[PDB]
Design a protein around this ligand. Sequence first.
Ligand SMILES: *[C@@H]1O[C@H](CO)[C@@H](O[C@@H]2O[C@H](CO)[C@@H](O)[C@H](O)[C@H]2NC(C)=O)[C@H](O)[C@H]1NC(C)=O
Lengths: 124, 186, 48
Amino acid sequence: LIAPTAVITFISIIGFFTSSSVHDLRQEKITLGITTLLSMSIMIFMVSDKMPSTSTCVPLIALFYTLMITIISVGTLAASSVIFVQKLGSIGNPPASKTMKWTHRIAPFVLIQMPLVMKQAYAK
Amino acid sequence: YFPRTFTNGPIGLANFLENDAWSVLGTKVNREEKKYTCCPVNYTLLHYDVVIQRKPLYYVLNLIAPTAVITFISIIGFFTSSSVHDLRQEKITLGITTLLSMSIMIFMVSDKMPSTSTCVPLIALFYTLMITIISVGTLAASSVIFVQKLGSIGNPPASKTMKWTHRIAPFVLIQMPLVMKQAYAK
Amino acid sequence: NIVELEWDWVAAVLERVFLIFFTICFLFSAIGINLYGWYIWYTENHFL
Ligand SMILES: *[C@@H]1O[C@H](CO)[C@@H](O[C@@H]2O[C@H](CO)[C@@H](O)[C@H](O)[C@H]2NC(C)=O)[C@H](O)[C@H]1NC(C)=O
């Protein structure tokens, strides 16, 4: 129960927050979230068999599945938040001064690097 | 027959060991005298009523919460696009997968519930409302695709259509793209 | 096409922050919960 659930959650997390390129429109990752949640339902279904209708306390495995489902659900919302930020570009107005200042200084900490086309546009 | 009641009530609960799913709220005893068709004399009966409440923390956690989360995720999926000026993709595979999941869930709610055909349980109304919301969301996404397809037939939208589309545009948090402004100015 | 490029960069970095944050949250959740149960399992096994 625990081992496949953790593996599926880890695989989904990478799927939410990895893209094939920086400068192309991202695809929605909500069916990815909904399929992961179907699987985890199948799993909690097979944990209700060997457990009673315990309504007094929250079992440790119940807290485990709750956290994984919460992570997938917020991960799905966080993925949709990235698409929203990319749509801001099509509205014309540039990002603010502080936005690009921090985006350039948290860029070396997390292992990301600026694409060549962005450097060429900056130089031009 | 006569009842012998305890200090705490008709049915003694001083030795009752707690049940995981049910809680006893009280007890009642009623002595009756019923005349039956067979015997020409009354029958003395004792009616012991036990009031038990369900503990609704397991069902809410395991059934209601994931269903609501899946419904919210599907709702966001139906009505969010990556851009305003490219053709939208069909969201019917998304609706059908959400409905498969919710079927799996109502399947696991039929186990701990009988074939109640007299009333509609509260959880049944909950699942019915969620399924209806998902279906109408799928139909609304198809409607948005249709309205977008109206653009390829050449004829422009009417005067009132654009006036309302522009004046409800600031209320809902949406903003006109730069290409549309450039086309308008040109 | 430079405003689009800049907002592409902001979303790209935002994605990486989410990837690191959710990976750390998942690791702490999965390992932390299991090791706590194993700690309770171990202590009450070898000390009762
Ligand atoms: C047999 O039982 C019936 C009840 O089913 C008795 O009829 C009731 O008697 C009480 C007390 O006199 C009245 O207040 C009720 O109005 C009666 N009718 C009912 C409850 O429907 C009947 O008296 C009993 N028979 C004998 C011989 O006592």
